[PDB]
Design a binder for this molecule. Structure first.
Ligand SMILES: *[B@@]1([O])O[C]([C]C([O])=O)[C][C][C]1[N]C(=O)[C]C1=[C][C]=[C]S1
Length: 270
């Protein structure tokens, strides 16, 4: 309450220029100060669910020490459009860890569906999120159906706030054991798909891990990140967008701009 939105930022103008809705939640983990705009509205997860998927796999690996190095062979029928890594290993298979890294760092769709199967499907990932205290997250469908981003549909959505809170628990808090936590962080740090989103607002000399999503319809795209500014506590943040019309375009620039406003609202010099 008292530390939320101490400094107002022009999010409304930004989303109006975009032609849609922007949802932002950012927390300074040192002071507890927050920036919050549409933070409790639901937005489609799109590929951003794959970060939480990889965390759920790591949590399972705490009870199954051989899980991450298990080899997984798959057929051509497992390939889904946008499977840039797993298509190169169709004839060989990949380990669970490799599928997880591919899902996080390349948004690989086939990898994500294979790992969902390992966890018992969308309800199994939802159950993992409930287990860390996230009551907002829901995954309902598989790739590619979960990308429909229909206005008003709560399937396959969360809120910026719940995403940020869960990300904090998994990357900085105690939801994962220490080895698994650092592996999750390392996967996020190695992401390749986010250079034009939150990372574009973050100085190059700060560490950052992130996970993106792009539904392909309804102007719907997103990014969440942990950011380590030097000399102060980390910042966790989530930026989600959507728009009213199916043919509306997403904007990476709008995501980067919203992330800049969030950092400015927290008084984090960048
Ligand atoms: B996912 O929602 O988003 C990925 C891109 C990202 O992480 O920002 C691509 C795979 C998933 N999306 C789709 O399959 C539909 C597409 C949208 C743009 C390229 S593919």
């Amino acid at each position: 309450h008292m530390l939320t939105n101490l400094v107002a930022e022009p999010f409304a103008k930004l989303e109006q220029d975009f032609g849609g809705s922007i949802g932002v939640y950012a927390m300074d983990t040192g002071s507890g100060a927050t920036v919050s705009y549409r933070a409790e509205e639901r937005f489609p997860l799109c590929s951003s669910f794959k970060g939480f998927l990889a965390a759920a796999v790591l949590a399972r690996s705490q009870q199954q020490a051989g899980l991450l190095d298990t080899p997984i062979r798959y057929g051509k029928n497992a390939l889904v459009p946008w499977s840039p890594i797993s298509e190169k290993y169709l004839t060989t298979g990949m380990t669970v860890a490799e599928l997880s890294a591919a899902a996080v760092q390349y948004s690989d769709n086939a990898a994500a569906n294979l790992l969902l199967k390992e966890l018992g499907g969308p309800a199994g990932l939802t159950a993992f999120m409930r287990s860390i205290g996230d009551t907002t997250f829901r995954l309902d469908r598989w790739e590619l159906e979960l990308n429909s981003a229909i206005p008003g549909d709560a399937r396959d959505t969360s809120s910026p706030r719940a995403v940020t809170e869960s990300l904090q628990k998994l990357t900085l808090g105690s939801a994962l054991a220490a080895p698994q936590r650092q592996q999750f962080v390392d996967w996020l740090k190695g992401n390749t798909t986010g250079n034009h989103r939150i990372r574009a607002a973050v100085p190059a000399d700060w560490a950052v891990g992130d996970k993106t999503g792009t539904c392909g319809v309804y102007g719907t795209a997103n990014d969440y990140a942990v950011v380590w500014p030097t000399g102060r506590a980390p910042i966790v943040l989530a930026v989600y967008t959507r728009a009213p019309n199916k043919d509306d375009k997403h904007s990476e620039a709008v995501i980067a701009a919203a992330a800049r406003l969030a950092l400015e609202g927290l008084g984090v010099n960048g």
